[PDB]
């Protein structure tokens, strides 16, 4: 399966698709969320009635914050990948002022919203989601891709109750070591904080942080300021709630491992050390990939184009200049 997946990825990686739609083909309905250089909006393809999520980026803001390379990485990778637990890019284009990425709309909202509301997920609920991430990372790492931004905020729940990973802003194709200080404070591996060279093992540490937060209701390392969070991460010490099972505590000690020669996912057997662990004994790995396992939660469906599972944001008029901005910089987009 992985050998055939690589052939498909490399063909698109070498010759990326460009300019597959235009802004005037879509009706802008409402803002679903915001980011550093723009926003995500619910749109409708007027001639079909199909709904989508459109990510809009201001070219001038990207250049100002020196994020050109990361923005090009995000689009090049997303147009080349194909997996059930990854959000699909339908169209991409640009104009004088902005960059546009049109993705499949996920109406169930972010895992973040549901997790904070109910407090914490049960161990079988946490297991179902964790299994989907394990398979997604197995797929991504095999293509020499590093994700670098795992958190409940980036995990969308579809109408089948399955996960769809979004935001490839820090995704990169790398063989060997990389050095960029990027990610979310609570999810940073100690090797990132200590300005060392790092590899794919940072995604396996992030999985440890995610499983802990899902089962406890709070992260393993928290404070009011990022500097205090970093102090707790580098110390090595982790305390587990009394309700955590014996098998869950053992897996987390192996994922939240400071020593790279001992961290699960980074050993001789690779991903198999995680997949064969006692906590995953009941997991049917093939049935998860095939979407045959019953989901613990199915989000309430209120028709097409409904935004009830998302928070409200202040609207703003999208401006397109009569003069081309940053033409050479984004030539390959």
């Amino acid at each position: 399966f992985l050998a055939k997946a690589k052939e498909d990825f490399l063909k698109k990686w070498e010759n990326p698709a460009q300019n597959t739609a235009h802004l005037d083909q879509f009706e802008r309905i409402k803002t679903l969320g915001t980011g550093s250089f723009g926003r995500v909006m619910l749109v409708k393809h007027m001639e079909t009635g199909n709904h989508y999520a459109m990510k809009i980026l201001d070219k001038q803001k990207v250049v100002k914050l020196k994020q050109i390379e990361h923005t090009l990485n995000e689009k090049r990778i997303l147009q080349a990948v194909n997996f059930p637990f990854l959000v699909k890019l339908e169209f991409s284009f640009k104009d004088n002022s902005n960059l546009y990425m049109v993705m499949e709309y996920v109406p169930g909202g972010e895992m973040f919203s549901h997790l904070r509301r109910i407090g914490r997920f049960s161990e079988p609920h946490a297991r179902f989601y964790a299994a989907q991430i394990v398979l997604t990372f197995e797929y991504l790492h095999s293509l020499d891709l590093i994700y670098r931004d795992l958190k409940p905020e980036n995990l969308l729940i579809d109408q089948q109750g399955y996960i769809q990973v979004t935001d490839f802003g820090f995704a990169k194709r790398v063989k060997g070591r990389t050095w960029t200080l990027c990610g979310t404070p609570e999810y940073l591996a100690p090797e990132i904080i200590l300005s060392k060279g790092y590899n794919k093992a940072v995604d396996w540490w992030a999985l440890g942080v995610l499983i802990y937060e899902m089962a406890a209701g709070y992260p393993p390392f928290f404070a009011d300021q990022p500097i205090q969070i970093y102090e707790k991460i580098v110390s090595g010490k982790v305390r587990f709630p009394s309700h955590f099972s014996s098998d869950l505590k053992d897996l987390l000690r192996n994922l939240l491992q400071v020593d790279l020669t001992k961290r699960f996912g980074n050993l001789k057997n690779g991903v198999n050390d995680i997949k064969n662990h006692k906590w995953f004994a009941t997991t049917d790995w093939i049935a998860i990939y095939q979407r045959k396992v019953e989901a613990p939660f199915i989000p309430k469906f209120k028709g097409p184009g409904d935004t009830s599972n998302f928070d409200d944001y202040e609207e703003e008029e999208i401006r397109v200049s009569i003069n081309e901005k940053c033409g050479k910089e984004f030539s390959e987009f």
Partner: peptide
């Protein structure tokens, strides 16, 4: 409790990238 300390902290909302 650790839960009470988390809910009283300033980082319970959506977390942005560094």
């Amino acid at each position: 409790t650790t839960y009470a300390d988390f809910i009283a902290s300033g980082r319970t909302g959506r977390r942005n990238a560094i």
